[PDB]
Write a protein that binds this ligand. Structure first.
Ligand SMILES: CC(=O)N[C@H]1[C@H](O[C@H]2C[C@@H](C(=O)NCCS(=O)(=O)O)[NH2+][C@@H]2CO)O[C@H](CO)[C@@H](OS(=O)(=O)O)[C@@H]1O
Ligand SMILES: [Ca+2]
Length: 314
């Protein structure tokens, strides 16, 4: 009947003699009451993906058209049309997310579009393999990923999922919005109302993205970014920069749209080939970068969402 297998203390597989894997198992047992043997069975099947390690290293911390190349990966007729279809298909959920969280449909549609092309590209890497690899064979971010692995196993246990069946990105991101396990834990919501938080359910994903945004400071109705007239070659740029509107004016910039009561902004500079395009980055732009720490990412999400919004009016 019951086979405890207390004597089976050594697991096989790529992480068999990994001290970090063994310590992690001990933690899961002590802290969460996991069965050591069940965990060894799971991790014995986990694969150490060298490709995941190489990519994490490649991503480790002009004008030549850099922004245009990034932009055209997302803003194309095919993509905008698929975005329109997604918006119309889930218009009610999007409007409800707007009412509940104050995050507009274009932002949610843009996020899900850039992340997975609205569910078409969810990822093919087993979350367990990615997280085990990064937790046990990647010292630089081992603590961060171990926390993600811990949360993932707890998630799988709770929602009764086979931890080995779930797939996603090389970093362990999941579903329509590519939520990391910790983001699922802190921000995912059962927006569909069936009692279960499913990152692969478009309705849940819509509400989850909205809640993530509100939690990270999204200001309802506030502008995201305003293009500037003029150039500011001397000034350092990027989503982390901060200048008063007065300083930017002194640098030779003027906003193309009224900035309201905003007194500061980040200076964003996009490489459009023929030169540079300067923008006043407002708080909501920064909020987008909280989802994925990149200026290009945030600008593509916002512009894709706007492109889809306009394409719907037609
Ligand atoms: C919604 C979400 O989960 N966003 C998280 C984001 O996910 C990113 C991870 C990325 C990813 O999977 N990258 C792997 C490489 S590739 O580009 O997919 O090929 N995609 C996800 C959504 O944009 O990663 C960063 C940094 O880890 C997290 O910030 S942190 O908490 O301060 O660490 C952030 O919370
Ligand atoms: Ca649900």
């Amino acid at each position: 009947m019951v086979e405890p297998q207390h004597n089976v203390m050594q697991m096989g597989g790529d992480f068999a003699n990994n001290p970090n894997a063994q310590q992690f198992i001990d933690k899961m047992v002590n802290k969460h009451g996991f069965d050591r043997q069940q965990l060894q069975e799971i991790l014995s099947q986990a694969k150490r993906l060298d490709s995941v390690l190489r990519l994490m290293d490649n991503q480790a911390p002009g004008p030549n058209g850099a922004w245009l190349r990034y932009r055209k990966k997302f803003i194309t007729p095919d993509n905008v049309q698929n975005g329109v279809v997604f918006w119309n298909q889930y218009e009610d959920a999007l409007n409800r997310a707007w009412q509940v969280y104050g995050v507009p449909p274009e932002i949610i549609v843009g996020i899900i579009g850039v992340e997975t092309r609205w569910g078409r590209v969810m990822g093919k890497t087993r979350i367990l393999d990615a997280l085990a690899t990064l937790s046990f064979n990647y010292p630089r971010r081992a603590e961060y990923f171990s926390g993600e692995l811990e949360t993932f196993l707890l998630m799988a246990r709770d929602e009764q999922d086979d931890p080995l069946n779930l797939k996603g990105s090389f970093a362990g991101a999941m579903g329509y919005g590519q939520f990391m396990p910790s983001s699922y834990k802190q921000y995912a919501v059962d927006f569909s109302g069936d009692g279960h938080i499913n990152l692969w359910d478009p309705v849940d994903a819509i509400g989850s993205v909205a809640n993530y945004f509100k939690a990270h400071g999204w200001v309802k109705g506030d502008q995201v970014a305003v293009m500037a007239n003029g150039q500011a070659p001397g000034l350092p740029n990027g989503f982390k920069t901060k200048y008063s509107i007065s300083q930017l004016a002194a640098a030779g910039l003027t906003p193309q749209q009224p900035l309201g009561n905003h007194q500061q902004a980040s200076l964003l500079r996009l490489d459009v080939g023929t030169g540079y395009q300067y923008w006043y980055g407002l708080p909501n732009f920064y909020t987008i970068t909280r989802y994925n720490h990149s200026t290009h990412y945030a600008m593509a999400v916002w512009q894709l969402g706007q492109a889809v919004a306009l394409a719907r009016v037609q």
